[PDB]
Design a protein around this ligand. Structure first.
Ligand code: OLA
Length: 264
């Protein structure tokens, strides 16, 4: 039954996420090749094709860094929708009280986002806009403060995460395990969530044993990555709060504002 459950989770991941690691690698390797964004000229060209409404405002267009942050938020909002549907495949999740489902997704979505971002990142840049753009790591570092500080820790995480050489069958189970953490603040049926966590982590552990016979510590490596992601999210939320307080034009989408509210 555990092998079947691993396959169910993998299939739910392939169905519900618009991007997966095979699809990303095909694009990153070289009919609609990605438009490369490496400077302000190519950002503005890319926007006019890929997000035309955002730059259709003349001198009322927002600052480039704020437009970029807006596009970052749109990607998060979409990934939150995909993760919410994916979670239905996790045994026990749909049997939880609605409020506990909300809490698990609230704390888990950005850990899952940054884990899955690794699949579209290499040391030079990342895919964006449903695989139709590639924005360089150096360009994002070139942005004015504080916006240059958003992505670099995520690239740092991803380079090490990618060196583990996971595939989508592994990542799907890892994302399921992120969602099933019984120590999230405010949970009301901790006991049932802990059993749900134990079950998915057992599936993950057996799958990694089978799929990565060469790396006998891969399961504890991934437990550590889960803790590293929690710290990355706490730090990310702190930076978002700086942006919120100090950048009046960088409006936060209400769904993400609710995720961040009372989080850490
Ligand atoms: C014209 C395309 C412009 C693309 C800009 C870069 C898009 C980056 C893609 C995904 C960003 C992932 C990080 C999201 C965290 C910041 C936003 C948030 O807190 O939700």
């Amino acid at each position: 039954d555990l092998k079947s459950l691993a396959k169910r989770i993998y299939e739910a991941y392939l169905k519900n996420f618009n991007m997966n690691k095979v699809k990303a690698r095909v694009i990153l390797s070289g009919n609609n090749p990605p438009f490369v964004i490496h400077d302000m000229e190519t950002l503005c060209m890319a926007e006019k094709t890929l997000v035309a409404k955002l730059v259709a405002n003349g001198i009322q267009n927002k600052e480039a860094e704020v437009r970029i942050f807006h596009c970052c938020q749109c990607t998060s909002v979409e990934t939150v929708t995909e993760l919410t549907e994916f979670a239905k495949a996790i045994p026990g999740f749909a049997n939880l009280d609605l409020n506990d489902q909300v809490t698990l997704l609230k704390y888990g979505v950005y850990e899952a986002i940054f884990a899955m971002l690794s699949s579209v990142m290499n040391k030079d840049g990342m895919l964006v806009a449903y695989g139709n753009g590639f924005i360089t790591r150096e360009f994002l570092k070139s942005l004015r403060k504080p916006f240059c500080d958003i992505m670099e820790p995520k690239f740092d995480f991803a380079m090490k995460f990618n060196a583990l050489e996971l595939d989508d069958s592994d990542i799907s189970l890892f994302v399921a395990a992120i969602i099933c953490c019984g120590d999230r603040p405010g949970l009301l049926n901790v006991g049932h969530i802990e059993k749900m966590q134990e079950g998915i982590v057992h599936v993950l552990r057996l799958h990694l044993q089978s799929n990565h016979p060469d790396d006998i510590f891969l399961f504890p490596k991934l437990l550590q990555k889960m803790a590293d992601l929690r710290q990355l999210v706490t730090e990310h939320a702190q930076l978002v709060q700086i942006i919120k307080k100090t950048e009046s034009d960088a409006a936060l989408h209400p769904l993400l504002q609710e995720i961040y509210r009372d989080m850490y």
